[PDB]
Design an enzyme around this catalytic site. Sequence first.
Site, short mmCIF file in Angstrom:
data_model
loop_
_atom_site.label_atom_id
_atom_site.label_comp_id
_atom_site.label_asym_id
_atom_site.label_seq_id
_atom_site.Cartn_x
_atom_site.Cartn_y
_atom_site.Cartn_z
N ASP B 48 48.93 50.43 40.96
CA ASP B 48 49.04 49.26 40.11
C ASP B 48 49.99 48.24 40.73
O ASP B 48 51.13 48.56 41.08
CB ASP B 48 49.54 49.66 38.71
CG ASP B 48 49.52 48.50 37.72
OD1 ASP B 48 49.05 47.40 38.08
OD2 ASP B 48 49.99 48.70 36.58
N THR B 81 47.00 39.66 39.25
CA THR B 81 48.42 39.35 39.41
C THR B 81 48.81 39.33 40.88
O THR B 81 49.50 38.41 41.33
CB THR B 81 49.26 40.36 38.63
OG1 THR B 81 48.93 40.29 37.24
CG2 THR B 81 50.74 40.06 38.81
N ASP B 386 43.55 44.37 26.94
CA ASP B 386 42.94 44.04 28.22
C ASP B 386 41.48 43.65 28.06
O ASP B 386 40.97 42.82 28.83
CB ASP B 386 43.07 45.22 29.19
CG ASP B 386 44.50 45.45 29.64
OD1 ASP B 386 45.33 44.55 29.46
OD2 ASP B 386 44.78 46.55 30.17
#
Lengths: 543, 518, 534
Positions: B48, B81, B386
């Site tokens: 992640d 991101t 999400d």
Amino acid sequence: QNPNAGLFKQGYNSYSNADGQIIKSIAAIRELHQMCLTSMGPCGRNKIIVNHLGKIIITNDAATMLRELDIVHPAVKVLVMATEQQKIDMGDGTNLVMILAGELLNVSEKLISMGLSAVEIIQGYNMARKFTLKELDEMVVGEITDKNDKNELLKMIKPVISSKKYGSEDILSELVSEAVSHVLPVAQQAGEIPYFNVDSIRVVKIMGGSLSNSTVIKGMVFNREPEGHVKSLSEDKKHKVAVFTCPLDIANTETKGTVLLHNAQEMLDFSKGEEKQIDAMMKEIADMGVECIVAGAGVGELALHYLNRYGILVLKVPSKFELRRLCRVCGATPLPRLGAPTPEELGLVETVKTMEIGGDRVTVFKQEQGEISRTSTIILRGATQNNLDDIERAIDDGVAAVKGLMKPSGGKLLPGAGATEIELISRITKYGERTPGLLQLAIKQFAVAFEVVPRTLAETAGLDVNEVLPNLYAAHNVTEPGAVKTDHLYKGVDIDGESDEGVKDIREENIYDMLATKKFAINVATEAATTVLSIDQIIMAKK
Amino acid sequence: ERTTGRQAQISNITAAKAVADVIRTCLGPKAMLKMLLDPMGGLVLTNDGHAILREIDVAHPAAKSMLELSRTQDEEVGDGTTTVIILAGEILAQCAPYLIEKNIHPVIIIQALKKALTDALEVIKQVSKPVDVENDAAMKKLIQASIGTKYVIHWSEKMCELALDAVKTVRKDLGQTVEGEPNFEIDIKRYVRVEKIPGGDVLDSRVLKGVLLNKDVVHPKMSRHIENPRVVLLDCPLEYKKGESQTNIEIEKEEDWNRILQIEEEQVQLMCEQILAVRPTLVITEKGVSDLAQHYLLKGGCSVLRRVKKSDNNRIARVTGATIVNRVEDLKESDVGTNCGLFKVEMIGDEYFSFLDNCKEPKACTIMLRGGSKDILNEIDRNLQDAMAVARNVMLSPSLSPGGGATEMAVSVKLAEKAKQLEGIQQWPYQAVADAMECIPRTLIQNAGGDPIRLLSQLRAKHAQGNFTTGIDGDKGKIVDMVSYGIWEPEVIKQQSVKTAIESACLLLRVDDIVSGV
Amino acid sequence: LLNPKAESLRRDAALKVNVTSAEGLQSVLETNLGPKGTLKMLVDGAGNIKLTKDGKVLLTEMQIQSPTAVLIARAAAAQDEITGDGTTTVVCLVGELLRQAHRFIQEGVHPRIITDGFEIARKESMKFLDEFKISKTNLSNDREFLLQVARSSLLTKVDADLTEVLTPIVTDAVLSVYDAQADNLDLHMVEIMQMQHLSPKDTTFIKGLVLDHGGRHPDMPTRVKNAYVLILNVSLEYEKTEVNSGFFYSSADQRDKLAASERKFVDAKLKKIIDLKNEVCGMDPDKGFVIINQKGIDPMSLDVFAKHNILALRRAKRRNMERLQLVTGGEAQNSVEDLSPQILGFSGLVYQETIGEEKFTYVTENTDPKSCTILIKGSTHYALAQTKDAVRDGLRAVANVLKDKNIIPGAGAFYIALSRYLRSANMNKLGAKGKTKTGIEAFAEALLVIPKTLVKNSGFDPLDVLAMVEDELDDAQDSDETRYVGVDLNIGDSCDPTIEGIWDSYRVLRNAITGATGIASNLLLCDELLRAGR
């Protein structure tokens, strides 16, 4: 500039098999192995180890030395714990287990040089062990009838007392056999319940005199003084004795009863109170017929004054472990309270006197016939303090072998002093060619590992190694014109130092090794070497 | 202490290059795992990107500024991101020889990035294709991309219906040239807040418009349902109060005890008369309510509801209209709770509830979540936010862009062709931006094992000839079409990826010196 | 491009060190794998010595800085909680799979194809896992076959001399507590206790429960046959007056009078207990009366119970009393006044082992004990830990055999066959990819490490045994029949694993192949080692 690799875990001292770790573990044991090689045997030598309390102690036995030594090697601790198996479960073989287990690792280096795996080395000794244990049943010639006679005990006790303080085995045998015969109860046709106990024989020593002045008395002998005007009692049988756990003092109250000082009027009542109460409590003890008071704790000053007028012998035993074995002698019971000597808790003793042992007056506690006691005492005398320490340890190892005389094959015997170890070599090599396969390498080396026992007996005796070894081979290997092998199977390693030549039958000196010691030592020696050979890696830290 | 000269510009580039080069392997579904070594014996093996950036300790402040961008970018959208950080870090790397070796003033580069930001967003609008946001069956397939390959894959059919009904609940579609364009005013944080209810079924989970409270009726005999309820909100609790100054009460005589007992009934009754002045059908107090006020308001024909959180009262004002009032003596009659649909108190999951709901869309609501256990509710919780974040980007505009590097290459091809017609000093850094746009799909090529030299050159030639929708496949690793094989991404992610990365890259070029001091 | 107090490896060096560090742990655990392995000894530094051949037990005691071996220790955490045995085999499958892939990484192959090649081969191995398994019946008469199953677990952790001793003990321990039906088995009902100062070959099985504190008195009967067990919750020790008072006495004789007043409270309870014995089978032969009495006993009650030949016990563990309620069946009696003969249970021969330091009382020969006890006795400390590690691994190995109806032959029967199947199947199928062949071939070559490791510790050439098995498998396929082949460690040639009796549980090998592939794949996915947080 030089990088580091090969250690992925943490900072430590790491050992791997690529560095010859199996050799390093044997070399670490070899450092302490040579100490035990010179121990076993009548010609063995003594080592000095200074205790952490600032006391120099010298002894032959390795089981005691391994406890006093600081060993940081865990591979040696395997043999140390294996030595405890010889000291605890048995009364002999503490010096032999370190020599056998140490040699099994030495003969294993020849198999390692050939590239043989440690598993086949262990599997080879396991198959060779069953071949040896099967022969040990056939190595027995005679069997002790367990008659428990004084002359019969001198046969088993003499070789056990041997290999320490040589030359005294004849005098020490008469002292141990007399004490063991007193502990052994009189019974017949009952083998189910064990009888002899190791703690039932307490050995004492006092400076002065010689070894020939020692004697054997039935009872528990105390070295403390009578502490009072009564030195000893009369010769009348069955003296009443009271054992008091509470110290002798003014009687107190079970509930509270705290003594505090405030005003001077209370101080006069405390001094006069202890005079009236103790005189009243000690009078009730003498009225019931108690002529002796055994106090495990201290004794006050006013208690000794009143008991001198009543004619009661004062006896103090600061050791509580001795009072438990004392109840089996006189029959008295300890009382946590004071002032109530119940006759059900009172014992009987025939004779209590005070005799001079080594120049000092000591109160002897003994008996004659009635009130059979299971506890005996061996009195020792000598000028040297260090020699008396090993004699007491020799008796402890001597009486522990009596425990091995019980049902589990305690009467069977085999010739020792190097007689059996050589004869087993010819039998193991006989099974080497008989058993096909890769086990022939480990079986042959298993018989060579038994050559260290006669070799150390020759080295400790100053004998030439090139002499005794070929003499024992030709003695145990002969050609007899017949099917049954005859003549001398008893040839051992002679003590020598005198006489003429060569070796001789060990039966002339009536020395032999007990089967319970020899058979159990082989199982411990193999399992001790099995653990070391099975460990190819260890991880330790800096100590 | 201080950094002068052109070396500080290099230090700002290497600060963003160090952060970018680490997370390069975090892009794509085939992204490789990363192993972080803490001073403790533990470790973090997860891939992640947002979880790794939070565990990295950096020194230079420009590296911390890139971490602050990831914190804001993670709140706007769920994914992408690290894509913004890699894009912002590569632009500074491609412009490094222009800023240093070519000796170009940084404002020239900064002013060029402002023009390249608008030119890049206009290309994305042309490459994107229209999509129907009113089709319920089409939106469930769009959310499914963020559903599958997760613990909710078995409930994916129920998850898409729960996420679609949740997005349609909070959103309000309004537009005009009169008061302006609100842009639908979709806020996931405050207004979509969920209440996890243990027990029930995942299919039984519904999205209700209103505020859900766990407090029941405080009186044994009271009306449990009101046809046309009126909600009144207030702060000060209903109970016996005390004087604001020092109060010393010492009672000795037996006849002085009844004086306080009478005042205790009067002080509670005066607070109830201020509430009943508007004749409400309901009474909702933020704090607790004494048993005395329960009987006083019972004779007035209204229900009493105590122990309501302050965060809930802010959402109640949206579904009701009652204005928050602190002191009960200041309570206005303008606070009527009219247009409240149902008061139903029906219990769900062995716990008494209350319904504040209505027939209208305030843009405030509380989602009712039920499942097989509390651990299932926690897995649905984070997965529902999400799922709505992906559905939010679709509802903010009816456009979808091809993923897998197709949109990244579509901008680089059009930027290189448009910069040739400008003919200015800014033309050189435009090619550096186009080269940075090609590194994102090339990163997927390096993670797919393919040749980055051969596949990137052939993929660029397919855009100048064929369409702009041809990307790179994650599972296969060969050049394929995104539209035919079902790989799509919303435009809002592409809008925030180009805008925030270039804007953050300009702020890093504006600092030529590091000031040391408190 | 660096941060203070941080160390990082870039390019492929970060992965090569992680593989090399994993190769170091492999060489450590390569020696102890299998029944021909070695027994490792670890030293904590505080004086503790532990000898254990289990993989996980060693990893928990060892401290490793290498983060790759940390995940290997975490990979074995789920192995013991599920499989319970074979943690060393899993480590050898992870390490060799990285070594075989290390050669392909140096050739320039991207790790994703190597990772995907292992996952595709893992799914194909599960398909062959169900084809190679042998379905075993659920009948309870398979104990004869379970003897060979128990040897598979025992021969690994010991020297094989204690296997014949522990074979009937471990096998009968699981079957006794397990009634015959589908259901399941609970290993918590089997208690493990230990006592020192004895040889390990004396280990025997205890059908009942072993109690710590024994009765101390010379007149207590040692062997009592067919006695009634009574759970007694009252305190038989010295008691005090129900109201607060004190002892005021002028002479010692008056103290006994005040003390006897409180002793009558115990004597009143002792008279009611002895009346229960004479009521039911008091003078009847072949009958006995035993008092459990969780609480203590005063020295006065020891003489009262001894005259009636009653076995008295005191200071019993609270947890051990809950087992006596299930084994014997006697209910807990709080008050003596409420004592009834219906509370009495039933038990068989009860004989106490007399040793000076400790005494054990056997509750054995019970009608419905529903419990067992495995007594592991050894002289040293490592002898107690080594056998306890073998029993706990042995009980869990037999557990998976009775729960799961499928059984697989061991001795490399599954590893050699699956490596041969995946080799010939990938060429016939060709459904994955051309570049995936490197990942599939690397997984097939990584499955041969176990049959080579087992024979390497025995000393025989792993190359010769590999050729003899492959030549025997090829001759079996030409004969058109089903013949299973395995590696014989004692002789060195091949063997039939069905005749020899070497068997592995289906659930152990299912999680081993899946677990070793998933963890080793995550190791190859590591791009860089980051140091942060300091």
